[PDB]
Structure formats: C-alpha cells, structure tokens
Amino acid sequence: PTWLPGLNPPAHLKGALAGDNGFDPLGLGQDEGRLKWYAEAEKTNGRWAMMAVAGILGQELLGVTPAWWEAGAKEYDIPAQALTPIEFIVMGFLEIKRYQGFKQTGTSGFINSAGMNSPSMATKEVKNGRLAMVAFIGFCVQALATRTQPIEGLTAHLADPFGKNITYYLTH
Amino acid sequence: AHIVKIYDTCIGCTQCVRACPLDVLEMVPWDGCKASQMASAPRTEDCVGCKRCETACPTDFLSVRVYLGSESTRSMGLSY
C-alpha cells in the first residue's frame, strides 16, 4: 500500500473507508472530521465521471454524426438553453436525496437491488473511479487543443506510436 | 463611571480634595508621609472627570490620576 517504498505519511494510513491507497503528500487527509467528506467527494467526482467516460468513447464505435464541442448545443427537442430548468430540477431532486444523512452511500434515492460489495470490490470501484477521473481530464486536455476528434488519438497512436505524440503535433 | 486611581507618590497635602467640585475624594490615614494621610476616591460614581484634582497635586507626575471611562448621566454633568 505504498506509492513508493519510502514512507507512509498519515494517521489515516490505518483508518480506511475501503478506498485506501496510501498517498497524501500535501496534508489533506489529516482532519478526522472531514475524511467523511473527502472520500465521498472523491467518490462522487468519480461516479459522475464514470457515466461521462461511458458516453465519450461510446460514440466512437457508435455514431460519428454528433461532433464533440458542438454536442453541447445541437437541435434538440427543447432548445439547449430552454432544457436547462429541467436540469436544474431533476438533477437536483436526486442529488438532495443522495445528500440525505450522508451515511456512507445511504440507499435513499440510489437503492441497489442485491449488491453491497463489502470486500475489495469497493476498492476496485475506487480504482476504477480514480482512473475514470484521469480518463475525463484526458478526454478534455488532449482533445481540448482543438486537434483530436471525439476520439482519434488512440487510433493515431496505434498507427504512429513513436510518431504522433504530445511533442509532435505543434500545429493548429 | 470614570476611573480615578491615586498612587503612593501622594504626600497628603489634601489639595485634590479641596479642588474636587463633586466630593469624589477624601483623606484616609496612611503612614507613608509626614502629614499621615493619603487620599481616596470612594465616590467615582459621581465623578465627571473634570480633572481639577490633578491640576492641584504638587507632586511631579501627578499622584491623583483620572481615567475617562464610560459616561453615565452623572458623569456627563446633566441637569436633564
């Protein structure tokens, strides 16, 4: 459980919430009343990014007719600025019911029918979660230089591994 | 209620009491002087802080000393 076999900093090194990996070099894992909030915010930044990554590489094998930066504004059922108060109500309505009590994923509006996963399946969802967040920031940096498409950087790097890389685009 | 605190540099010449226009000061026995007396301020509730006491003390760096505190209806000198 070391990031490198040199050190193991926190007093939260033993205390876990089934998502421990042992790395805190800046000091944001030491206030004991707030790790009930750090671990949930790390979870929820992952869970809203898991559904993202499923709907980013999903339209790579699927439809190419949607673009990426225009995908936020196309001709929808409602107008894109008009469908926003549906988003302010419906997203928040499940969000508040998720917030209730914060009793370590209390099944109030996200009841799972079963499946609880008290062993390492909890840690694997964290490791899938801590890599889905790196996935989205991958999807919105290397695309975000207006160069690569929905997703064509991997298909380029399978073609040119030692060719097309980070220090080899250097254009528009 | 002004804060009047006097000090051991008093010689007991009681000129502060005679100068006080509000009977804040009185003379108490004390052995640290020839006149066997040192002032006292039992009536600082009635003091206005007009500092006629410490215009009258002879001692260098005045023995009586008035600190202007929080002002009630008697400290502001009010007939109304």
Binding site: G27 | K51, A56, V66, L68, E71, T73, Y80
Partner: protein, 731 residues
C-alpha cells in the same frame, strides 16, 4: 440601550453620543466586549470579504451603467471627438434648460461625461461591444455574491479558521506572491496575448472562438523549442491603426519602449511581456519561504540574524517577528505604507506613461486619474503612521523588544523629530522666502531680480534618460556612451523618440518654477512626516505627559493642568497632519494640473514665466482657469458646467462648516443645548414630545473628526469641481 451591542459601556450611556460612538468604534474590533484573539481574526477575515464583495459590486455597477446608459459602442468608432458617458441622469428637480444642457455626447437624455476614464481601460483590454460589458457586469455580480456568501460561511462554526491559521505568515506570503501575484499576472498575460493583443489588430476573440484562434501564427512552437524572439517578429508598425488590421503586425511579446503612434499609449505587446516577466519573478519569489516541505526560508531566522557588529543597530532586528506576527496595527501600518506609495507610483507613472489607448488625449480623464490616486495615496500614507502610532500603544512590548531597531527608534526619538523639524523649518523658510522675494520683484516691475535657481540635479537626470533639450550629453543624450550603445536594438529607440517629443508628459521640460515647487512638495512631505512620526514616537508619553499609553490612542486631553494639554493625544497628533497632508497633495496637484494646462493649451511659456512667483499661481491658475467654472449658471442661462459650478460652491460650504467644529469647541455648545433642553421642557404642547437619548454636545475627539471630515470633503469637492470643469470647460 441596545444599539452598541459591542460596547456595553456605551449601552449604559443615556446620552446622544451613544449613537455617535456606536458608529465610530464599531470597527475597532480590539476593544469590543468579550473579544478574544481567535474572535478578533475571524471578524477581520470576514470583513475583508465584505470589502471585496463591495468592490466587485461597485465594478459591476460601472460595467452595467456604461453598457446600458453609456455610448461605448459609439465611442469605439470615434474615440477622440465623442465624449464618454458615465450614467444617465434622472433628477426630477431639473428644469427644461437643465435637461437640454446636459444632453451631450450624442445621447438621448441627460448624461454625465465619465472622467474616471474606464472607457480607455476597457477599450484596450478588448471590450468593443456593449454585450461584452453586460457579461462582465453579470460575472462580477456573481463573483461579488460569492464573496458575500464566503464571508458568511467563514464565520459559521464548522468553517471558522483556527488561531494558528492566521499567524502562518509563511504559507500566506508563499501563496500570495506566487498565486495571487504571479499566477494572476500569468493569467493576465493570458488575457492580453489571447484576447487583448488580437483585438487591437481587428480580430474578434470572444468566448466562442478563443479555442480556434491561434494568438501567434506558429504558436507554442517557439516556447517549446526556445527561439522566443519568434514572438517578436512583426510587431505593430509605426503606422498601425488601433482597432483595425491596417498595418497590423503579428508579434505577441515585443519589447519596444515608448509609445504607440496613434493612441500615444503604451504598446500592448510590451505590456504583455511586462506582466509575463514579473509573473515569472513573483512565482520564483513565491518559492522562498519555508512552509511545510523542509525547504525555504524561516522568517524567524532572517530578521534576528541580521544584526550588524560594533553596535550599529542595537540588537539588530532581533525579536521583531513576534511583534509583526502578533500585532495587527504593525501589519496594517506596513501595508498602508506600501500601498500608499505604490498608489502614488500608479499616479506618477500614468500621466507620463499612459497605459491605455487614447489616454493623454482625453485631458479630463488624465486630470481625474492623477488627482484621484494622489489623494487616495495621501490618505493611505497618513494612515500608515496612524496605525503605526496605534502600534506603540496597543501592541508594543519593551520586554519583547529589548534593544532591537524598533526600540532604538524610541530611544533616539528626539533626534528623529528635531532633525525633521530642522528640515521642515529650513524648507519653509527658504521656499516661501524665495517666492516672496520673487513676488516683490514682480510687484516692483523688475522680474530680473528674481531668484531663479535652475533645477540642475533633475535636468541632469532627464539628460541621463535621453532628453537632449539641455545638452548635458551625459548618458543617453550621449550618443557615444555605453548605455546608449548597449540598447539600440533592445529597448531604446522607442523610448528616445518618446522623450524628445515635446508634447507628451514623458519627462517634461523643467525650469526654476519647478525648482521651487518640488522643494515645496519636499516641505509638505517632511512636515507631514514631522507631525506623524511625532505622533508615533510620542504616543507612549512625553515630558508633558509620561503615561500617555495608559489613556490610549484617542483621548481628548489630560486636563488644563500642567499648562494646558489641548491636542496632546496621538490621535490629535495624527489629525493635525491631515491638514498638512491635504495641503501637500494640494501642492502636488496644483503643480500637476497647471503645468499640464499650459502644456495642453500650448502656452508652455505661460507657466514658466508665472510659476516662479505666487501671484502667477493665483492670477494665472486659480483666477484665470475658473472663468468658465463659475459661469456654469448665471442669470443669462446655464450650461453643462453647472453641476460642477454648484459643487464648487458646495465644496466651499462644507469646508467652512468644518471651521465651525474646529474654531468653536465643545462647551460653548453644551451650554447652548442646555437652553434648548429648557426651552423644550417648558414649551406648551411640545412637552408631549420628549427624547430618549439625552441631547449632549459632540465630544472633543468627535469634534476633531466631524470638523476634519467637513474640512476634507469640502476640500475634495472644491478642487474636483475646479479640476473637471477647468479641464473639460476648454477641452
């Protein structure tokens, strides 16, 4: 009984000064009832959110009223002849001649010409349309609501900071230098290079197409390779037209110096390389201090270890750190000293080096922006000494400060004040004495007998900066020197063309009228510090009153005894300086305005003839330039200057009302109120009415403050009325 919730000693006060002191020591947090030091820092920290949320609501107000009631989209196209608009007028007290006399600038209804000059700042940072200004207003209105909610939440007991969070001077100064100064300036060069550089070249970079427009045609390739001169290849030419692409150029970080030819402003490209360069330095200087990672400098070992041998500076700076970290008035006094000098540095470097396009052509903007940040600098600088004088009473500890440089200040404190009192007395003798000598020689018809000392020591500096009007041929006026020859491709030919132009404010040519007035400024600087440093040093006591520290900072007196002690306190030693401050900043702004009026009219000899003697200050600057001001309304009619004509008499009225609280003192007035109490308590049918707070006269310290405020508001409104209307009246 309830209103001073902070001071229960004021809640037991049955008189009407309960209202006045509920207001004035409400932000004196160190003297509230039950205040602790953890409770001290939390109310200060939330109040700084309150100041920030006001500033951003204020600035979003400027963005709104310009976008709605202003003519920014009309002023973009013609930025010389079209006058700017601040905000439209709805005064239902107006008459019909006062509606049509204030309709100007091509607008519909009555308007105010904005002399604050936020158009020139916005036009050069890329604002072109009103739709770009509403977005900025709604943005800052959101950000102002963020800081309102932040100051609320950082008082809530879950989110109250610990006491050791505030005293971490390492981590703050490491974050504010690198993040708040470095990253912010790094991000501002991001606004310049991406947006504000190509907007002047006639290319709209909005939020829609900023991820499509390359700022440079071969962008990010010189930064990753190394040839950074590729960013300065084809700059804005000498025939560039600001706002269009006519002779545009493609460079993003040029290092030219001097001015743009059309706007006579600074180039946008070297303003980008400017804020990039100090961003690199502030980030590098933001990795100096030891916070949490084992590297860095400890402040507790840099002060104490710089003690010179042979007793030059006592015990050195030993022990200052616990008197800077624990004391707030020391930290506030340093900050007001620093900000108050780099507020003048803002003012001194924006008339000579105007940074925004078509500034130093709009003359009333230039007059307001200099005079504003000089009085703002004047008030902040005298508060540095004020909160420096509060430090010696409320926070100074001699046992903690045995023998350091701070106690040696109090040790030789009479040598400080007497040598200031010599410099102030020498300057006042020999500056006034020369003006009176010159005035008598004007009165006896013989101007040749004047004392006209040429400013050699400053003309030597201008010639060293490249002004060949005087012919010292020294360094940059010397064409065969070294410093001239080390920079002929680097930064000099823009700078040397910009000084030797006679019609900008870059190093104005000076004569003996400028000898006399800089010594008058030096008089006013040395005398204002004489009053203030005496107010700091003698805050703890004098021979007249050796226990001044026992009363506090702001007390009335110590009685009529010991000869009489009117104005003995360090507050009363601070307030006398505000008169000598407003005098001094009045002298720097008279001299700035009148040398610039004679520059902009063209009669540059009308200053140098008349500035050498004090009648020319009166009959050629105050008498002559107030011709169209006081004619703002007359029985013939009225014009656009009548709002500045009215304020000019309004300013004289507040000023003279200030003498009522300054010449008449309290005790004439307390007896007068005692007759009014009688005449109220004996009048039939008004005995139905009775007060709650007893009417007493304004206290001694209050009469200082109320009189100084009427002095200062009427001072400011008088000169600002004369400044705006004499400039814009003829311009």
């Amino acid at each position: 009984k309830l209103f001073p919730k902070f001071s229960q000693g004021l809640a037991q006060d049955p008189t009407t000064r309960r209202i006045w002191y509920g207001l004035a020591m409400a932000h004196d947090f160190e003297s509230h009832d039950g205040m602790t030091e953890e409770n001290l820092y939390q109310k200060i920290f939330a109040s700084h959110f309150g100041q920030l949320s006001i500033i951003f609501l204020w600035t979003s107000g400027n963005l709104f009223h310009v976008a709605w009631q202003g003519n920014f989209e009309q002023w973009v196209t013609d930025p010389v002849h079209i006058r700017p608009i601040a905000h439209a007028i709805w005064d239902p007290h107006f008459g019909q001649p006062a509606v049509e006399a204030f309709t100007r600038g091509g607008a519909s209804g009555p308007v105010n010409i904005s002399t604050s000059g936020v158009y020139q700042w916005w036009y050069t940072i890329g604002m072109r349309t009103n739709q770009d200004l509403y977005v900025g207003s709604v943005f800052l209105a959101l950000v102002s609501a963020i800081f309102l909610f932040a100051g609320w939440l950082h008082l809530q007991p879950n989110f109250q900071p610990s006491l050791s969070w505030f005293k971490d001077a390492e981590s703050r100064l490491n974050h504010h230098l690198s993040g708040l100064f470095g990253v912010s300036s790094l991000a501002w060069t991001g606004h310049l290079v991406h947006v504000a550089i190509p907007e002047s070249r006639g290319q709209h970079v909005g939020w829609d197409n900023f991820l499509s427009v390359l700022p440079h045609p071969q962008g990010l390739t010189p930064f990753f390779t190394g040839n950074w001169a590729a960013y300065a290849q084809s700059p804005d030419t000498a025939s560039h037209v600001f706002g269009t692409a006519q002779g545009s150029g493609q460079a993003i970080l040029t290092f030219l110096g001097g001015f743009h030819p059309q706007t006579q402003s600074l180039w946008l490209t070297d303003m980008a390389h400017h804020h990039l360069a100090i961003a690199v330095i502030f980030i590098v200087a933001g990795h100096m201090y030891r916070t949490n990672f084992g590297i860095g400098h400890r402040m507790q070992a840099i002060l104490e270890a710089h003690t010179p041998p042979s007793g030059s500076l006592g015990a050195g700076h030993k022990g200052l750190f616990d008197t800077v970290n624990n004391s707030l008035h020391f930290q506030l006094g340093l900050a007001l000293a620093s900000v108050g000098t780099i507020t003048s540095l803002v003012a001194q470097h924006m008339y000579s080096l105007p940074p925004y396009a078509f500034q130093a052509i709009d003359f009333t903007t230039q007059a307001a922006l200099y005079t504003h940040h000089q009085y703002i600098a004047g008030f902040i600088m005298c508060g540095a000494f004020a909160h420096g004088a509060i430090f010696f009473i409320r926070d100074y500890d001699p046992e903690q400060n045995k023998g350091n440089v701070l106690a040696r200040m109090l040790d030789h404190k009479e040598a400080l004040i007497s040598h200031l009192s010599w410099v102030s007395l020498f300057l006042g003798f020999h500056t006034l004495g020369l003006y009176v000598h010159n005035d008598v020689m004007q009165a006896f018809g013989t101007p040749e007998k004047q004392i006209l000392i040429e400013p050699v020591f400053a003309q030597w500096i201008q010639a060293a900066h490249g002004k060949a009007l005087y012919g010292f041929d020294f360094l940059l006026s010397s064409k065969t020197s070294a410093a001239f020859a080390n920079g002929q491709s680097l930064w000099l030919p823009g700078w040397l063309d910009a000084i030797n132009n006679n019609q900008n404010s870059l190093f104005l040519t000076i004569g003996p009228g400028d000898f006399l007035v800089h010594h008058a400024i030096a008089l006013g600087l040395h005398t204002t510090t004489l009053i203030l440093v005496k107010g700091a040093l003698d805050a703890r006591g004098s021979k007249l009153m050796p226990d001044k520290k026992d009363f506090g900072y702001s007390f009335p007196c110590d009685g009529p005894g010991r000869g009489g002690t009117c104005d003995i306190s360090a507050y009363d030693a601070f307030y006398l300086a505000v008169f000598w401050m407003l005098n001094t900043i009045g002298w720097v702004t008279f001299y700035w305005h009148w040398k610039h009026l004679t520059l902009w009219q063209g009669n540059v000899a009308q200053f140098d003839e008349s500035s050498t003697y004090l009648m020319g200050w009166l009959r050629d600057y105050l008498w002559l330039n107030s011709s169209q001001l006081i004619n703002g309304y007359n029985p013939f009619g009225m014009n656009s200057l009548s709002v500045w004509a009215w304020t000019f008499l309004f300013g004289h009225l507040i000023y003279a009302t200030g003498f009522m609280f300054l010449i008449s003192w309290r005790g004439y007035w307390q007896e007068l109120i005692e007759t009014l109490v009688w005449a109220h308590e004996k009048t039939p049918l008004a005995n139905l009415v009775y007060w709650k707070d007893k009417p007493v006269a304004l206290s001694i310290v209050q009469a200082r403050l109320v009189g100084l405020a009427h002095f200062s508001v009427g001072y400011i409104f008088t000169y600002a009325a004369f400044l705006i209307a004499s400039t814009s009246g003829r311009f």
